[PDB]
Write a protein that binds this DNA or RNA. Structure first.
Ligand SMILES: CN[C@@H]1[C@H](O)[C@H](NC)[C@H]2O[C@@]3(O)C(=O)C[C@@H](C)O[C@H]3O[C@@H]2[C@H]1O
Ligand SMILES: [K+]
Ligand SMILES: [K+]
Ligand SMILES: [K+]
Ligand SMILES: [K+]
Ligand SMILES: [K+]
Ligand SMILES: [K+]
Ligand SMILES: [K+]
Ligand SMILES: [Mg+2]
Ligand SMILES: [Mg+2]
Ligand SMILES: [Mg+2]
Ligand SMILES: [Mg+2]
Ligand SMILES: [Mg+2]
Ligand SMILES: [Mg+2]
Ligand SMILES: [Mg+2]
Ligand SMILES: [Mg+2]
Ligand SMILES: [Mg+2]
Ligand SMILES: [Mg+2]
Ligand SMILES: [Mg+2]
Lengths: 131, 200, 163, 87, 80, 134
RNA sequence: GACGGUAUCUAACCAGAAAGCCACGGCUAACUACGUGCCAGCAGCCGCGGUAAUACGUAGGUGGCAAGCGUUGUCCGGAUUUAUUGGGCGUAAAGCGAGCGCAGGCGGUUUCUUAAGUCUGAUGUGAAAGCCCCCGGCUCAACCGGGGAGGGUCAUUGGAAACU
RNA sequence: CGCGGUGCAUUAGCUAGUUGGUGAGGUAACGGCUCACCAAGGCCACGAUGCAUAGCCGACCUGAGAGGGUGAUCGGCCACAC
C-alpha cells in the first residue's frame, strides 16, 4: 500500500522528467498542490492545473525543458519520511546546491521554500529538496 | 635549538637562494652530497610539498614545532588567504624585521643580534628573536650597541628597504608602515603547497 | 566539444601500469599510461595510452586526453557547489572550499583539479582507489557542476533571484 | 558563617585574588557562594575591582569580611557606607 | 506559590483500595536515530474513595510521599 | 536496515583484541588473579633459550627465548640483534611486536635493559639494540 | 618576608665549557661503496638475504627532527571496517522453505477543532576553572588576569497551526 | 520527584513488609520507617530479576562533523578510614 503520496509525487516527477515526458498527472492533495505551486513559481515546472473528479480530484503538471531539451529539474529528493521525520530549526534550514536548488518546507506559516523560511526566521519540516 | 650548519648546502638542497643573492647556487647548484651532481629521479608531490615547507622554515630559521604553531595561528586569522597570512606572520617575526630594516646582512646575523639583546623595541630590550612585531612598532638598536662595526657595515651595505618598511639610519630606528603584500614577499615560494602540506 | 588548439595545455602522468598479455611463448609486457592534461583555467581531460614503451604510451594518452578535453565551471578559486561523481567503483565527493584552503584531495583527484585550474577545494574518495576509475568519477562530478547563470537562465530567473 | 574573603588565583609567585563570598567551612580555593570583586597586590597601588552593591547587601545579610577584605572595603569606603546604613 | 507536576493518564490497576495505578504514555526521540518511541510510565496515585476504575483517563498531581510507592494524588476523572 | 529495525537492534561494532595480550594483564599475588592493566613492557624470566626455523619462505635460525612474565604467563619472545648473553633463568624485559617469520612469537626482548646486553659492535640504530655510544 | 640576596639590573673575560637520535627498496623525503652469501640477520605490510644486496653489518653521503630522538603500550583517525549523517543482501558475506497472524512500525482524500510532537518569543537555570571570541599582564611564549559567547533532546510561560 | 548517562536474554520471571489499606509507635520531617489487624497486591520483553564491570560530573583526547575513547592533575558531589 502507498505510505507516502508526497514521495510518490516526487518520484512521478522524477521518472517523467527522466524520460522527458511533457506532462504528468497525480491524485490531488493539499500538500501536493502546495509543492506544485512552489515549483511553478520557482520556474522548475512549466505549468500547473487542477482537475476535480469524484475520487479526490487530480493535478496535472507540465514539465519544463530548456533549450536543446535540457532538463531544468536535475532531480528530486524526499527528506522527511513516514519512517523518519525531519524537522529543522530556524538556523538549521539547509541550502540546496549553495542556494541554486531549493528546499520545500512545511511551517506554521504554510508550505514555503528555504529562502522564505530563513527570511521569516522559522523552522519546520523539510518535505523535499529540488535542484 | 638553532640550526648552525652550512648554509649553501641547505640553500642548494632547497633549490632557491635563501640569502637572495644566489651566491650559493652560483657554483655547483646541485643538492649536497655525492649524488648531487649526477642525474636524480623525479620528485613526488609529497617531496614538492615538503620542499616548499622546508623553503619557508629554512628561510626564517625556525624549528618545526614553532613553525607549526605559527601556521596554526595564521589559520586562526579569519580573513584572507591562509598561506599569505602565514607568510605575513613569518615576516612580522622580530628577526625578519631587523633583517628587512637592514641592520644585519643575514637573517642568522639578525637573529644573533636579537638574541644578544642589541635590539630594542620602542626603547625596551628584547632578547626573543621569535618576538612578534606589529605594524607601527619602532625597532631600535641598543644605544651601547649603535657604535659597532657589524651593524654599521650592514646599514651602509644595505640599499633596498622593502616598500612596507620605513627606516632611519641616524637613529637606527625602523618600523613596518604596513603589512607586507604577497608580491612584496618572496615570489619563488608557493604558500599554497605549504598550506596543503600541513593539511596532510 | 573543446578545441585543443589555442590552449597552452600541460600534462601530468597519473599512473603507469605494466599490463601483461600471456602468449604461447610467455608474457607480452606492455605499459598503459593514464594522463590528465589541462589548461589551469577551466579545461581539462584525461586519456589512456597502451604501448610497448613508456614514452610511447605517454604520448598516446596525451593525444587521447587532448581529444577528450572538457570544460569545468569554477566560481572564484573553487567550484560552484558540492558534487559527487560516480563511475564504476569510483566515487568522489567534491565540496567548495574557502579561499586559501588549498586542494584537499588524493592522487588522481589532485591531478585532475590542479590541471583544471582549481586552487581551493575539499574532496573525499568514497569508492575504489583504482586510478582510472577515480579520474573518470572526478570528471563525472565536474560535469555535474552547474553555473549560476545557466541555472538562472534555465529557470527563467535572474542569478540574484535564484540566490 | 558567611565570609567575604580572598580566593587565591594566578600562578606561582604571581598571586591574584578574587573577593568572593563563601561559607567559612569551604576550602580556600574551593566552593564559594558568589564573586564580589578582585584584588591584585602585585601593583604598587594594589588594584581592586569591587561590586559595592553586592558587598553591602551581604554585609547587611550578615557576612563577616576577613581582615584584608575589611581593609579593602575601608579603602573603598564600603565599610563606612554599611556603618551609616546601620545608623 | 509553586506548582506540582500534574500528568494525564489511564488507570491500569485499582484492585488496591485507596489507590490506583496510572500510565502516562509519553514518547521520546531515540538518541541515535531520532525516531519517536512509545514510552510508558506508570504512577501509584492515592484515591480518596476508589472513584476511578480500570481504563479511566484521570489527572494526578505529585504530592508528598504517602506510602512506599505513592507520590501522586488523584484530581480528575476525565473519561470512563 | 529500516530506522525502526535499527531502533529495535542498534548497530554493534566489532571488538578488537591486542596483538600482544600478555602485556595487558597483571597479576595479584594476594588475590591470586590476573588484573587488567596495560603495560608498555613486562619483566620475565627466560625458562629456555634456543633457535627456531622460520616459515617456509625464509630459511634461518631465529634466536628465541621462552619467558615466564611477571604475570605468570609463559610466552615466546624474539631476540633481535646479533649474538646475545641471554640464558635460562636470566631476567629480561619484553616489548610488544610480532615476528612475521616465526609462527608463535609476539614479543621482543628489549636489549640493553636488565640482563639483555647490548649488541656488540652495533654502530647504527644504537638506541635499538641498546649499546652505548662509542 | 620562609622564599632570599631569589627574580632582576649593571660591569669585565672568553667561541671559549653546551647535539644528539632515527631513517634513506615501495608505501615515504633521503644512495653509493665494500663485508656477507637463504648465513648472519631485517621487517609495520609488501617482502629482503642462495657470491656483483640502494632492503642485512659497516663506511661515506644524504633526509627528518632536535634537547631531544626512536621503540613499546593505549584511544581516536584514516575505517563508509556497524554506513542516523554514511553500506549492503541475483552470481563476491548477506532474503527466513512458505504462509496465518498478537503486540509493535507505518498508513488513502478532506472540513472543523486541539496543541502532544513540531517551529518560535520572553523569563529562570546549565557554578567557578577549562575550550572558543575579544582585551590586558608577565622582555615573547607557555602561563596569568578581565569581559563575553558557547554548552539543555532543561523548567515556567506567551505565541504559530503547514505536517505528525 | 521528572528526565540522562555500562555489557550480557547462552540471565525470564521477581517480590512476602513484599504491594495497599486501618490504626499505633517512631523521626528534624513524609513514608512499611516499625509494629498489630485487613486484603492480595506490587515489579517485569518499554528488560524486572540475576550476573559482570564501574565512583559520577565540569572536563580531557580524537574527529570535518555526527560520534568514538578517557574520568589524572584542578573544581563540585558522593562513598570509605585495618
Ligand atoms: C609450428 N608452428 C608454430 C606456429 O606457427 C605458432 N603460431 C601458430 C608459433 O607461435 C610462436 O610464434 C609463438 O609466439 C610461441 C612460440 C613458443 O613459438 C612461436 O613459433 C610457433 C611455430 O613454431
Ligand atoms: K626500508
Ligand atoms: K544508513
Ligand atoms: K524466497
Ligand atoms: K503542538
Ligand atoms: K499504614
Ligand atoms: K570506585
Ligand atoms: K567500612
Ligand atoms: Mg623546544
Ligand atoms: Mg576510451
Ligand atoms: Mg603594594
Ligand atoms: Mg622516496
Ligand atoms: Mg635497521
Ligand atoms: Mg642497509
Ligand atoms: Mg567510522
Ligand atoms: Mg559461491
Ligand atoms: Mg553467496
Ligand atoms: Mg571499583
Ligand atoms: Mg570519519
Amino acid at each position: 500500500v502507498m505510505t507516502d503520496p508526497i514521495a510518490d509525487f516526487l518520484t512521478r516527477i522524477r521518472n517523467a522528467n527522466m524520460v522527458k515526458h511533457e506532462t504528468l498527472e497525480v491524485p490531488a492533495s493539499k500538500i501536493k498542490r502546495d509543492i506544485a505551486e512552489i515549483l511553478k513559481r520557482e520556474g522548475f515546472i512549466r505549468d500547473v492545473e487542477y482537475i476535480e473528479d469524484d475520487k479526490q480530484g487530480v493535478i496535472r503538471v507540465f514539465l519544463k525543458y530548456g533549450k536543446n531539451e535540457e532538463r531544468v529539474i536535475t532531480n528530486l529528493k524526499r527528506i522527511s519520511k513516514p519512517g523518519l521525520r525531519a524537522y529543522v530549526k530556524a538556523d538549521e534550514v539547509p541550502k540546496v546546491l549553495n542556494g541554486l536548488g531549493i528546499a520545500i518546507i512545511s511551517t506554521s506559516e504554510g508550505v514555503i521554500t528555504d529562502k522564505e523560511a530563513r527570511a521569516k526566521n522559522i523552522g519546520g519540516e523539510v518535505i523535499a529538496y529540488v535542484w | 635549538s638553532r640550526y648552525t650548519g652550512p648554509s649553501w648546502k641547505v640553500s642548494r638542497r632547497l633549490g632557491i637562494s635563501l640569502s637572495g643573492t644566489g651566491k650559493e647556487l652560483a657554483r655547483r647548484p646541485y643538492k649536497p652530497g655525492q649524488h648531487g651532481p649526477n642525474s636524480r629521479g623525479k620528485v613526488s608531490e609529497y617531496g614538492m610539498q615538503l620542499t616548499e615547507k622546508q623553503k619557508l622554515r629554512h628561510m626564517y630559521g625556525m624549528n618545526e614545532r614553532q613553525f607549526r604553531t605559527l601556521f596554526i595561528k595564521a589559520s586562526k586569522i579569519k580573513e584572507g588567504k591562509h598561506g599569505v597570512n602565514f607568510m605575513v606572520l613569518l615576516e612580522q617575526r622580530l628577526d625578519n624585521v631587523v633583517y628587512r630594516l637592514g641592520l644585519a646582512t643575514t637573517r642568522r646575523q639578525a637573529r644573533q643580534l636579537v638574541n644578544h639583546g642589541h635590539i630594542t623595541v620602542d626603547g625596551k630590550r628584547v632578547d626573543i628573536p621569535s618576538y612578534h612585531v606589529e605594524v607601527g612598532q619602532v625597532i631600535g638598536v641598543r644605544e651601547k650597541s649603535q657604535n659597532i662595526s657589524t651593524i654599521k657595515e650592514a646599514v651602509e651595505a644595505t640599499v633596498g628597504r622593502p616598500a612596507f618598511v620605513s627606516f632611519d639610519t641616524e637613529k637606527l630606528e625602523g618600523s613596518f608602515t604596513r603589512l607586507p603584500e604577497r608580491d612584496e614577499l618572496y615570489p619563488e615560494i608557493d604558500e599554497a603547497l605549504v598550506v596543503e602540506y600541513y593539511n596532510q | 566539444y573543446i578545441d585543443p588548439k589555442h590552449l597552452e595545455l600541460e600534462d601530468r602522468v597519473v599512473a603507469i601500469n605494466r599490463v601483461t598479455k600471456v602468449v604461447k611463448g610467455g608474457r607480452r609486457l606492455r605499459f598503459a599510461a593514464l594522463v590528465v592534461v589541462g589548461d589551469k583555467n577551466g579545461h581539462v581531460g584525461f586519456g589512456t595510452g597502451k604501448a610497448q614503451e613508456v614514452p610511447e604510451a605517454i604520448r598516446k594518452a596525451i593525444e587521447d586526453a587532448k581529444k577528450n578535453l572538457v570544460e569545468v565551471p569554477m566560481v572564484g578559486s573553487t567550484i560552484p557547489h558540492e558534487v559527487i561523481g560516480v563511475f564504476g567503483g569510483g566515487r568522489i565527493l567534491m565540496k567548495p572550499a574557502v579561499e586559501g584552503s588549498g586542494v584537499a584531495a588524493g592522487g588522481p583527484v589532485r591531478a585532475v583539479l590542479e590541471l583544471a585550474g582549481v586552487a581551493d577545494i575539499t574532496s573525499k574518495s568514497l569508492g575504489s582507489n583504482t586510478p582510472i576509475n577515480v579520474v573518470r568519477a572526478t570528471v563525472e562530478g565536474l560535469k555535474q557542476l552547474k553555473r549560476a547563470e545557466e541555472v538562472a537562465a534555465l529557470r527563467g530567473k535572474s542569478v540574484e533571484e535564484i540566490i | 558563617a558567611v565570609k567575604i574573603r580572598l580566593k587565591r588565583m594566578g600562578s606561582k609567585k604571581s598571586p591574584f585574588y578574587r573577593i568572593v563570598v563563601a561559607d567559612s567551612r569551604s576550602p580556600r580555593d574551593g566552593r564559594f557562594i558568589e564573586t564580589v570583586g578582585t584584588y591584585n597586590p602585585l601593583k604598587d597601588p594594589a588594584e581592586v575591582v569591587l561590586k559595592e552593591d553586592l558587598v553591602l547587601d551581604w554585609l547587611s545579610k550578615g557576612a563577616q569580611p576577613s581582615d584584608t577584605v575589611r581593609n579593602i572595603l575601608s579603602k573603598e569606603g564600603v565599610m563606612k557606607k554599611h556603618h551609616e546604613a546601620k545608623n | 506559590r509553586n506548582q506540582r507536576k500534574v500528568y494525564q493518564g489511564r488507570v491500569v490497576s485499582d484492585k488496591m483500595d485507596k489507590t490506583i495505578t496510572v500510565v502516562v504514555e509519553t514518547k521520546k526521540n531515540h538518541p541515535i536515530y531520532g525516531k519517536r518511541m512509545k514510552y510508558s510510565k506508570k504512577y501509584k496515585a492515592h484515591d480518596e474513595n476508589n472513584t476511578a476504575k480500570v481504563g479511566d483517563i484521570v489527572k494526578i498531581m505529585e504530592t508528598r510521599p504517602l506510602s512506599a510507592t505513592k507520590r501522586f494524588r488523584l484530581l480528575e476523572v476525565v473519561e470512563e | 536496515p529500516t530506522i525502526n529495525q535499527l531502533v529495535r537492534k542498534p548497530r554493534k561494532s566489532k571488538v578488537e583484541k591486542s596483538d600482544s595480550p600478555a602485556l595487558n594483564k597483571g597479576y595479584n599475588s594476594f588475590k591470586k588473579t590476573q588484573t587488567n592493566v596495560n603495560s608498555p613492557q613486562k619483566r620475565g624470566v627466560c625458562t629456555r633459550v634456543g633457535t627456531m626455523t622460520p616459515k617456509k619462505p625464509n630459511s634461518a635460525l631465529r634466536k628465541y627465548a621462552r619467558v615466564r612474565l611477571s604475570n605468570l604467563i609463559e610466552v615466546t619472545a624474539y631476540i633481535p640483534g646479533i649474538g646475545h648473553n641471554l640464558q635460562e633463568h636470566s631476567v629480561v624485559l619484553l616489548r610488544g611486536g610480532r615476528v612475521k617469520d616465526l609462527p608463535g612469537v609476539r614479543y621482543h626482548i628489549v636489549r640493553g635493559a636488565l640482563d639483555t646486553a647490548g649488541v656488540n659492535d652495533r654502530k647504527q640504530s644504537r638506541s635499538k639494540y641498546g649499546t652505548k655510544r662509542p
